[PDB]
Amino acid sequence: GGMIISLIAALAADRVILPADLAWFKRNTLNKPVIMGRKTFESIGRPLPGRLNIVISSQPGTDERVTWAASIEEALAFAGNAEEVMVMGGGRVYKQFLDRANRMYLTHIDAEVTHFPDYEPDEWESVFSEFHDADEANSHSYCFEILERR
């Protein structure tokens, strides 16, 4: 019943948008509809297996392995009856969906290194936190966080 729109993003120092983070992203997107910007799809260069790939863009695309949406309302309709839709970037897409999003999956990475939208922390409360030190596989330390709208 109903639908929850969730943002998922890896944020470095500032709002600027690591195998462990990819596992976390895989953990929280698999078996769910996914909405991404055209540039993000280009960067990934493929469809993500195990989920419905919705690419939101003003113009169509030559890749029919994914579904192309012309507006946010079209993208949400393409999610069907899914309980939760994952909005996975990029920065323009996060801007588009922030007001409609009630959940946020954030990975904070300790790297200096296009900004994530500014949001009032007063409107969001943390419902999960987990810190991980860098190790052999991961060059940096990172913190996983899930925020839900007050």
Ligand SMILES: COc1cc(Cc2cnc(N)nc2N)cc(OC)c1OC
């Ligand atoms: C799964 O592969 C990718 C995924 C993403 C999106 C993404 C990746 N990580 C997190 N925490 N949130 C996201 N929205 C971004 C990527 O680079 C554009 C990817 O290629 C490595």
Ligand SMILES: [Cl-]
């Ligand atoms: Cl698949």
Ligand SMILES: [Cl-]
């Ligand atoms: Cl729109």
Ligand SMILES: [Cl-]
């Ligand atoms: Cl902004």
